[PDB]
Design a protein around this ligand. Structure first.
Ligand SMILES: CN[C@H]1CC[C@@H](c2ccc(Cl)c(Cl)c2)c2ccccc21
Ligand SMILES: CN[C@H]1CC[C@@H](c2ccc(Cl)c(Cl)c2)c2ccccc21
Ligand SMILES: CN[C@H]1CC[C@@H](c2ccc(Cl)c(Cl)c2)c2ccccc21
Lengths: 176, 173, 174
């Protein structure tokens, strides 16, 4: 009740801060209503399939695949931040799979391509994904909400790698 | 070798349409098992790469058996759609089924295999065919059924240590 | 035959107490396999009738595999509870563990086996030990682990058609 109410408030608040300033940095205190929340994962991540991304990429030592997942999420977070900035990139409506950074980070994670579809890159192409022909501008509320969930999962994976997660003992039971 | 593999694909797929309850031997699947082609060339509809990657948790003797059991149930669903007397409830699959929730729904991506059969419409209690579709896609159902049968056979051969490429497959886990 | 069954029962239950990783052979469990004693006397803690009856749905080649794999993971939980180098989080089990959903939670009554191990208190996301309890009942854990080991072996031998009472047990699944 009281904890579930502060979660939806912080989610809508931080999503607008990304729309107001796409380059805004968030501290661990600003995201604490979303990290320390004892809400189930289905209620915490409404768009980003956090359960899938963790399940399909938990291979090897946790010191490595949590690091590989966090790096791919940092790249995916930059894609959503670029869409929300007033000075959008010249090729904002098209991501190519053969990018050297993309192939070494996002394409190295099972399900990283599907995260781009959440931003709006829904049209499949033999070299990448693209925004649909006709969509003049991206849905800011959709991009900001997905960017916040991507940034939140990256923060959650980062907190686990430093043994500083609020539910560190609980999350480690799902990997051992 | 890509031509010989594609010829045996249409051969077994046409055999499933002829008799949906026809049992295949290891020799009949030999041109598909012993093969040097990549996985993307051997599995066109079934995403065998993610089906193993998203479910290779724990001991291999455990999750390979769970994967093959779920594929055995998914194979029966495709064979039922190719039967001359289809089940009376072939148009939909319920998530709350005791057999379904214990085998297919226990595997990440098992519902995606049902979508390949034709169960594309999502409902709160399961998946169903589009209401405007009279009959299932026999060519598509037979193709997915054969690939599901092949993946389950490959997982089974790994557990018996009789896979033709057993050594190479074990290094991928 | 009841005294002979209990004689080898504590012999295997004590072997798991000293060495939890010590694997048992078929000849070691055969005295407990070919016994014509009723199931009520062979399983005192594990509800073997519940696990088989409530999950014998579909083809026997399918649910016997699902039952065997779930018990193999349940046997790993009991063995780790008796290990001298216990895991750091032996006091709790999460339902959303990717191995748990595909094996134990896929079987009707699998969570009750964890309660026999000691995981009696329930959380919205799993089961855990009571806060007052600091060490598990090594006698009860080894007793349940042995019976879980017993049921897994019985289901595995039936799938291989090498069970000592194969024809008798097959008549209970028609
Ligand atoms: C169904 N989702 C599961 C698996 C993901 C798993 C999870 C979620 C986030 C992270 Cl960062 C990790 Cl390591 C693991 C989890 C956590 C709490 C409740 C449920 C779940
Ligand atoms: C990209 N696909 C990979 C992973 C699956 C992996 C594979 C395929 C079938 C099985 Cl039964 C297993 Cl255990 C593992 C494989 C095999 C041959 C060529 C490629 C691949
Ligand atoms: C009513 N008691 C039943 C339980 C299940 C049944 C049983 C027990 C173990 C297994 Cl492996 C199977 Cl297939 C079936 C049985 C067997 C012998 C004596 C009694 C019983």
């Amino acid at each position: 009740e009281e904890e579930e109410r502060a979660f939806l408030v912080a989610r809508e608040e931080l999503a607008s801060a990304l729309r107001r300033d796409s380059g805004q940095a968030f501290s661990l205190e600003q995201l604490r209503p979303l990290l320390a929340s004892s809400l189930p994962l289905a209620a915490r991540y409404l768009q980003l399939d956090a359960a899938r991304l963790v399940r399909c990429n938990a291979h090897g030592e946790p010191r490595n695949y949590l690091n590989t997942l966090s790096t791919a999420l940092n790249i995916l977070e930059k894609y959503g931040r670029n869409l929300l900035s007033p000075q959008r990139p010249r090729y904002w409506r098209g991501v190519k799979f053969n990018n050297p950074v993309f192939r070494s980070t996002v394409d190295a994670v099972q399900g990283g391509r599907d995260v781009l579809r959440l931003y709006g890159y829904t049209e499949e192409q033999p070299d990448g994904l693209s925004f649909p022909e006709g969509q003049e501008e991206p849905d800011e509320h959709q991009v900001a909400t997905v960017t916040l969930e991507v940034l939140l999962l990256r923060t959650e994976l980062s907190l686990l790698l430093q043994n500083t997660h609020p539910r560190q003992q609980a999350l480690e039971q799902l990997l051992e």
